[PDB]
């Protein structure tokens, strides 16, 4: 009924010896287009390349690894074909050896690491690149490009803007982790000079660690003290539970400890120049409840 049409075509790429090259080519049509990768006429055939098809079937990716020069060069052709028609696009690969790398070629200062994330949580794969002109970051999961398109989704590629003479970031953020999301990720820095890949990073997805929830309990209660007037006493208040409750010090209804740095688990109160008797109230707080205990300070 309909002829084939290119929805995405491979572009010219400049890679490094022992590196990776990936060409993306996908088309639409009825019946569905068949994607063939030809190297100067005939189809590529070796033990270093690999054709990875889209789950859609819309297209595929040519994966050359590791890059060998001048063997890998140069031009390849994507051919989409059905019963009703056929179309073709070409593109040039260039692979420069280790002493042909320009100043300002994309470099990965920090790649992605192995990551085991509990399901339905956030998993943000990191990357940091540097090159001239400034490299653009992009991602591949299991030899396929990561759809980080503008349309709202869990998979966002972070701007992660760090300022100055610092490297570019471009971290891949994955909200609501799933069993589909786990797999082999790869970061890719790309500029005018060419393309650099990061070492592969496995993402694993596990079940959530069931944690028994417990309301706060005073492991170390605030003790009472008698002191020579103008003396200095340090009262230790320690509370436990899950989640570990904040520990705060109060004098009457007056808050002493600042909310911004409210310690989790443990708080010691430092009383200096005490020439007045008073009761100090330690207070532990968590989403499972609030408790309090008194420390009676008397003056000798």
């Amino acid at each position: 009924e309909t002829p084939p049409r290119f929805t995405r075509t491979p572009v010219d790429q400049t890679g490094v010896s022992g590196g990776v090259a990936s060409f993306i080519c996908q088309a639409t049509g009825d019946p569905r287009p068949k994607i063939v990768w030809n190297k100067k006429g005939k189809k590529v055939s070796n033990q270093r390349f690999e054709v990875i098809e889209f789950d859609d079937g819309s297209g595929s990716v040519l994966r050359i690894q590791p890059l060998r020069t001048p063997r890998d060069e140069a031009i390849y052709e994507c051919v989409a074909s059905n019963n009703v028609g056929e179309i073709s696009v070409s593109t040039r690969l260039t692979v420069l050896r280790e002493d042909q790398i320009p100043r300002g070629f994309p470099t990965i200062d920090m790649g992605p690491q192995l990551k085991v994330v509990e399901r339905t949580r956030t998993a943000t794969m990191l990357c940091a690149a540097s090159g001239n002109p400034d490299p653009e970051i992009t991602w591949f999961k299991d030899f396929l490009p990561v759809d980080t398109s503008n349309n709202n989704g869990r998979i966002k590629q972070l701007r992660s803007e760090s300022i100055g003479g610092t490297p570019i970031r471009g971290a891949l953020q994955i909200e609501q982790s799933e069993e589909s999301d786990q797999g082999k990720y790869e970061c890719v820095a790309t500029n005018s000079a060419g393309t650099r890949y990061s070492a592969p990073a496995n993402l694993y997805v596990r079940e959530l660690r069931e944690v028994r929830r417990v309301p706060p309990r005073f492991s170390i209660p605030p003790t009472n003290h008698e002191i020579m007037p103008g003396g200095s006493v340090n009262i230790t208040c320690v509370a436990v539970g899950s989640p570990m409750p904040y520990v705060k010090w109060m004098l009457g209804a007056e808050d002493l400890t600042p909310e911004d740095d409210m310690p989790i688990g443990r708080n010691v109160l430092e009383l200096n120049d005490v020439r007045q008797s008073a009761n100090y109230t330690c207070v532990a707080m968590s989403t499972l409840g609030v408790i309090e205990a008194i420390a009676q300070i008397t003056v000798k």
């Binding site: 789950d55 690491q113 192995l114 990551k115 085991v116 589909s180 496995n202 694993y204 596990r206 660690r209 069931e210 492991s219 170390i220 320690v238 436990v240 688990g265 443990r266």
Partner: protein, 241 residues
């Protein structure tokens, strides 16, 4: 005899063939077979596989990952996993396995992923993982591991070590902590850490460790002099006066 015997649901997607035998009530798998050409992920969740004897899964040599959790498993006779060279991922959490002995994980050469959380685990033979040389991620949270033996992770490429929720007083650098340089995620939270002269090694190690590799906090449960305090901000004098 599965799957043409209709016993389990071996639906063929996505990209991998999942053999779902979860909650079918299997007591042994020496009587059963599995496809010759296809590779598969085997799921033996709630089946009540109480004991694993030598050369179970023998006809399941083509399994890529084994997932047998909530079986109430407690006894693993050495060589029970024999033949599973292909397996990369082993789920044996949520059972009652009280210890790891040597040759417990016999047969699993390719294994990269091990989950044994919630198992009341206590003793772990030094040469328990010594042949699992692809084990990148070891998850042992919520158990009763008192100590880790000297050479446990020698030549084991551990990258994710989840040790939360145990009875773990200390962690030595000598042999144990030095032998895992490649860590990227380690989880030590919820352990009765005894901050004494013997924990110094941990502290310093956590300093030299890659940043954000430690997930969670290491709080001192002992002594009461130090209880509730982060190892983060513990002066050496206080650990070792």
């Amino acid at each position: 005899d599965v799957c043409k015997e209709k016993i389990c649901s071996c639906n063929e997607i996505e990209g991998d063939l999942h053999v779902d035998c979860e909650k079918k009530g299997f007591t042994s798998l020496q009587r059963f077979t599995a496809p010759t050409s296809q590779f598969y992920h085997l799921f033996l969740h709630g089946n009540s596989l109480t004991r694993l004897f030598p050369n179970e899964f023998a006809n399941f040599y083509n399994a890529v990952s084994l997932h047998m959790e909530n079986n109430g498993l407690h006894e693993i006779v050495p060589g029970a996993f024999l033949g599973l060279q292909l397996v990369k991922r082993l789920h044996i959490n949520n059972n009652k396995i009280k210890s790891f002995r040597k040759q417990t994980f016999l047969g699993l050469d390719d294994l990269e992923y091990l989950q044994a959380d919630f198992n009341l685990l206590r003793d772990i033979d030094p040469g328990a993982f010594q042949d699992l040389n692809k084990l990148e991620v070891l998850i042992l949270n919520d158990n009763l591991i008192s100590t880790l033996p000297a050479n446990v992770f020698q030549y084991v490429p551990i990258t994710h070590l989840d040790l939360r929720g145990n009875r773990l007083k200390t962690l030595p650098y000598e042999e144990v902590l030095e032998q895992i340089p490649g860590i990227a995620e380690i989880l030590l939270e919820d352990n009765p850490w005894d901050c004494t002269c013997d924990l110094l090694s941990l502290k310093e190690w956590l300093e030299n460790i890659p940043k954000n590799a430690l997930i969670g906090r290491v709080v001192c449960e002992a002594p009461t002099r130090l209880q509730g305090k982060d190892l983060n901000e513990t002066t050496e004098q206080d650990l070792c006066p």
